[PDB]
Design a protein around this ligand. Structure first.
Ligand SMILES: *[C@@H]1O[C@H](CO)[C@@H](O[C@@H]2O[C@H](CO)[C@@H](O)[C@H](O)[C@H]2NC(C)=O)[C@H](O)[C@H]1NC(C)=O
Ligand SMILES: *[C@@H]1O[C@H](CO)[C@@H](O[C@@H]2O[C@H](CO)[C@@H](O)[C@H](O)[C@H]2NC(C)=O)[C@H](O)[C@H]1NC(C)=O
Ligand SMILES: *[C@@H]1O[C@H](CO)[C@@H](O[C@@H]2O[C@H](CO)[C@@H](O)[C@H](O)[C@H]2NC(C)=O)[C@H](O)[C@H]1NC(C)=O
Ligand SMILES: *[C@@H]1O[C@H](CO)[C@@H](O[C@@H]2O[C@H](CO)[C@@H](O)[C@H](O)[C@H]2NC(C)=O)[C@H](O)[C@H]1NC(C)=O
Ligand SMILES: *[C@@H]1O[C@H](CO)[C@@H](O[C@@H]2O[C@H](CO)[C@@H](O)[C@H](O)[C@H]2NC(C)=O)[C@H](O)[C@H]1NC(C)=O
Ligand SMILES: *[C@@H]1O[C@H](CO)[C@@H](O[C@@H]2O[C@H](CO)[C@@H](O)[C@H](O)[C@H]2NC(C)=O)[C@H](O)[C@H]1NC(C)=O
Ligand SMILES: *[C@@H]1O[C@H](CO)[C@@H](O)[C@H](O)[C@H]1NC(C)=O
Ligand SMILES: *[C@@H]1O[C@H](CO)[C@@H](O)[C@H](O)[C@H]1NC(C)=O
Ligand SMILES: *[C@@H]1O[C@H](CO)[C@@H](O)[C@H](O)[C@H]1NC(C)=O
Ligand SMILES: *[C@@H]1O[C@H](CO)[C@@H](O)[C@H](O)[C@H]1NC(C)=O
Ligand SMILES: *[C@@H]1O[C@H](CO)[C@@H](O)[C@H](O)[C@H]1NC(C)=O
Lengths: 68, 404, 184
């Protein structure tokens, strides 16, 4: 935490670099929080960005209504 | 007889900066004899580490709960048309690299040895995305996204629903939709000017940050205290004083540092309790008068509340409450009921008013004269048991149909 | 574990200090031991008081929720349950309380066309509690939480002004049973 590992699977984050876990471009549900917008989980262990949720863009119109 | 749209600013802190403190680094540092000596004190450092991990996880929990109220991210339509209403100040700016609306940008600009600061899990970007999704949900779905799947609804229909919820009929909306939109835009501009011109509007977050900085600075400065010893330096005492008593002197120094650290931890825990209480209050306000209409009076806005727009803030949240305020009152003469044909007529939802020679029924929040009829009135008993009743005839909406 | 801490002394047992060391400074050693244990007890008591404040706040919140949406119906949104709250079941738990909330969740939405009002005979008609819904050819009225279409009738609509001031209004007739009941 707060220590640069270049002067003491490498993925440098704002809090610090992670050794032993590979970064994945795809994002899934987070399990073990870490900080600075990144966290790691077990699936081997991988790290990914935050997953806010499934994208759902509603079609907004001036004359459209959705009655349940 | 008239109404105005006013925007009020409410600021509630959410969390502070996460801090981690190490006892063996803050007290003495790189002394092996100090490390050997502190093991005889028990597990006080373990208790401190547990307390700081607890405060960090509580800060993370409340900052996750106060913002991630929905699991679906909604996006605004590309067409920025809402029946004349303007939302460019609250909607995020695509030109900004951080995808932040200028209100949040102004709010961010107005806020300025073992110890370390943990970066928050919920940083600025996803907090801004959550606020944008909440704004899209409350501008395109109303309260439907907060009670299930998002349902499309026009903005004037949502305004009519909110006016019916607070107790205003839909007739005054379509006749003054342009006036309402202009008043809302003027109120948004005025509150933006007031926010930009008043540096004391963000006082709560400012004093929270100042208190945290002062506490950290005082904790740092407390290391250079004598604490009854000859000097605040450890190595000169170790290499100059006879160890037999030098052990007593260093024990007094480290126990004074431990007392200062325990006081700092207690103050941080009390501040964390206050912050958790404020965050719970903000979460209740978000549940009440952000994701839906709230019937509470003077809870999250002065006057008849309509809706609230959450805005991202550094270590806090700012709400833009929009309220309904009546104005331009006029004097009228009222009666408890109307005695017609030996029967008393009581209004179902209105009130009988008189301008001096004629009587009319009007809404409880707006002036709109209507002819007293049988559809909006009910008959219960005669007109002599009541006190203060007057004389008036009741027009029958059915009689002229069969009169001819 | 606090009883096992020497606190800088030579032993963790006060009897050993009393029977092992000279009393003139064994008094000071015992004073140091008891003041260290007193400080540990003070720290534990402060932690207990902080936990008591947190538990009191949680219990007050639980009592407020039980007075809100257990003894009656609550109109608050997402206060004690996701969705339109209906009622709840209070249950007993060890050192806690569990509520089995029952809520109303709308589902299976359908796309429809809506209008702000209906202009009939030069007058604007607004729904009293529903909304105007069109399925493609005819206009109906239903509630905002369910799909129960009905014929446009003056019983559930009120007239306030003309249709020349409103925006986005459509043309449709308004059914009234007075004409068929008086035709015969
Ligand atoms: C209710 O108040 C609003 C403003 O508070 C009035 O709107 C103004 O109307 C005058 C002339 O009618 C215009 O010159 C102003 O520019 C309007 N102001 C705004 C902000 O639009 C409105 O007329 C009032 N209604 C009644 C019935 O008196
Ligand atoms: C909504 O308000 C914004 C500003 O609050 C308006 O943007 C202004 O538009 C005028 C005319 O194009 C420009 O001269 C200003 O410089 C703009 N201001 C800013 C801050 O960019 C906007 O026109 C309003 N209406 C809509 C539909 O967005
Ligand atoms: C009270 O309001 C009523 C309703 O507007 C007024 O009655 C109208 O008055 C105007 C002129 O004052 C006449 O041209 C209309 O013919 C009246 N309407 C009806 C149905 O007769 C009444 O005058 C008002 N009273 C006062 C004292 O101002
Ligand atoms: C409203 O009208 C009723 C009857 O039309 C009034 O009742 C009468 O009042 C007069 C004097 O005010 C009495 O002499 C009658 O005996 C009353 N008749 C009955 C059947 O009660 C009533 O007083 C009127 N209200 C007001 C305020 O004057
Ligand atoms: C919209 O609803 C109306 C009434 O519910 C439908 O009209 C009926 O349609 C059925 C289906 O063929 C006919 O058997 C009835 O005779 C129709 N009734 C009337 C009064 O015309 C209409 O078809 C629906 N439109 C759509 C596009 O679904
Ligand atoms: C709704 O109906 C009204 C009348 O039933 C229409 O108003 C007429 O419009 C035509 C052409 O636009 C004019 O020639 C007439 O003079 C209008 N009559 C009146 C009394 O205004 C109106 O256009 C219709 N609207 C829609 C959208 O169909
Ligand atoms: C660590 O240092 C290297 C160069 O020494 C730098 O490129 C890198 O950005 C630093 N990492 C962090 C997280 O500051
Ligand atoms: C109504 O009348 C009272 C006294 O007659 C007066 O004090 C008040 O200002 C009046 N209200 C208005 C709106 O004129
Ligand atoms: C109002 O009060 C006055 C004096 O207290 C009284 O003369 C009058 O009858 C009262 N009117 C009503 C409608 O109660
Ligand atoms: C309604 O139509 C829009 C686009 O026209 C579509 O995105 C949406 O899924 C539709 N709703 C339903 C329930 O099918
Ligand atoms: C809705 O908007 C579209 C495009 O902005 C416009 O063509 C249409 O007339 C509008 N309808 C109503 C009822 O305002």
């Amino acid at each position: 935490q707060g220590v640069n590992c270049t002067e003491v699977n490498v993925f440098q984050t704002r809090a610090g670099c992670l050794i032993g876990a590979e970064y994945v471009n795809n994002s899934y549900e987070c399990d073990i929080p870490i900080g600075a917008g990144i966290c790691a989980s077990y699936q081997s262990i991988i790290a990914y960005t935050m997953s806010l949720g499934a994208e759902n863009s509603v079609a907004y119109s001036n004359n459209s209504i959705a009655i349940p | 007889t008239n109404f105005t749209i006013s925007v009020t600013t409410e600021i509630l802190p959410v969390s502070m900066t996460k801090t981690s403190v190490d006892c063996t680094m803050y007290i003495c540092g790189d002394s092996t004899e100090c490390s050997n000596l502190l093991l005889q004190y028990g597990s006080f450092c373990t208790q401190l580490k547990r307390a700081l991990t607890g405060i960090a996880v509580e800060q993370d929990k409340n900052t996750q709960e106060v913002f991630a109220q929905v699991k679906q991210i909604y996006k605004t339509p590309p067409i920025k048309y809402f029946g004349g209403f303007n939302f460019s100040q609250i909607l995020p700016d695509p030109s900004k690299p951080s995808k932040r609306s200028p209100i949040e940008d102004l709010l961010f600009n107005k806020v300025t040895k073992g110890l370390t600061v943990l970066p928050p899990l919920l940083t600025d970007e996803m907090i801004a995305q959550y606020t944008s999704a909440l704004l899209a949900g409350t501008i395109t779905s109303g309260w439907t996204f907060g009670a299930g799947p998002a349902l499309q609804i026009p903005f004037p229909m949502q305004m009519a629903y909110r006016f019916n919820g607070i107790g205003v009929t839909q007739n005054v909306l379509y006749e003054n939709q342009k006036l309402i939109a202009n008043q809302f835009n003027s109120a948004i501009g005025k509150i933006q000017d007031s926010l930009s011109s008043t540096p004391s509007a963000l006082g709560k977050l400012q004093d929270v940050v100042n208190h945290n900085a002062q506490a950290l600075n005082t904790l740092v400065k407390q290391l250079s205290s004598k604490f009854g010893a000859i000097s605040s330096v450890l190595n000169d005492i170790f290499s100059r004083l006879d160890p037999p008593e030098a052990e007593v002197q260093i024990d007094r120094l480290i126990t004074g540092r431990l007392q200062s650290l325990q006081t700092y931890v207690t103050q941080q825990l009390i501040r964390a309790a206050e912050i958790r209480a404020s965050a719970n209050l903000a979460a209740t306000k978000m549940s009440e008068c952000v994701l839906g209409q709230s019937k509470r009076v003077d809870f999250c806005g002065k006057g008849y509340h309509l809706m609230s727009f959450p805005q991202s803030a550094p270590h806090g949240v700012v709400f833009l409450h929009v309220t309904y305020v009546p104005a331009q009152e006029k004097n009228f003469t009222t009666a408890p009921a109307i005695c017609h044909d030996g029967k008393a007529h009581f209004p179902r939802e209105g009130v009988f008013v008189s301008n001096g020679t004629h009587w009319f029924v009007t809404q409880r929040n707006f002036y709109e004269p209507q002819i007293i009829t049988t559809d909006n009135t009910f008959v219960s008993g005669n007109c002599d048991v009541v006190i203060g009743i007057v004389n008036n005839t009741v027009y029958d909406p059915l009689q002229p149909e069969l009169d001819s």
